[PDB]
Design a protein around this ligand. Structure first.
Ligand SMILES: CCCCC/C=C\C/C=C\C/C=C\C/C=C\CCCC(=O)SC[C@H](O)CO
Length: 134
């Protein structure tokens, strides 16, 4: 029973964020700033209802969803695309498919120990993020 992801989470590693951003066609200037940044993620979770706020000094991004309920997602101030998103549970791993113009786009997020893991995929690029609880 490790589905409880509530908390404030501070990034400690960010593997291949550059490649993931390039796969989303983020321009070089934006990538140059973004790749440097420590992200903080606040998760407010009530059962299958999630509200997430991811912040940095450069961009912030909020996304809310209910597991199992498809929603329209506009990735405002990231790559600024519209997708149809669905989050499901696979065991205790939160799995999101973002269907749209980029093939194989999604993410997976789960707890292991006292860390939160987030793997973001676009095409053949995977970014692996690890967060420690504050
Ligand atoms: C917001 C901080 C970005 C700094 C880089 C700025 C510009 C780079 C521009 C584009 C890079 C694309 C995405 C950013 C990656 C992760 C952000 C979070 C996305 C989520 O919601 S993932 C699910 C959530 O974890 C659920 O709980």
């Amino acid at each position: 029973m490790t589905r409880d992801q509530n908390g404030t989470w501070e990034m400690e590693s960010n593997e291949n964020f550059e490649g993931y951003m390039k796969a989303l066609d983020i321009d070089f200037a934006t990538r140059k700033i973004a790749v440097r940044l420590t992200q903080t993620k606040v998760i407010d979770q009530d059962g299958d209802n999630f509200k997430t706020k991811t912040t940095s000094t450069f961009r912030n991004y909020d996304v809310d969803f209910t597991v199992g309920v498809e929603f329209d997602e506009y990735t405002k101030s990231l790559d600024n695309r519209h997708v149809k998103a669905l989050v499901t549970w696979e065991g205790d791993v939160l799995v999101c498919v973002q269907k749209g113009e980029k093939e194989n786009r999604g993410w997976k997020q789960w707890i292991e120990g006292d860390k939160l893991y987030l793997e973001l995929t676009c095409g053949d690029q995977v970014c692996r993020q690890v967060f420690k609880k504050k």
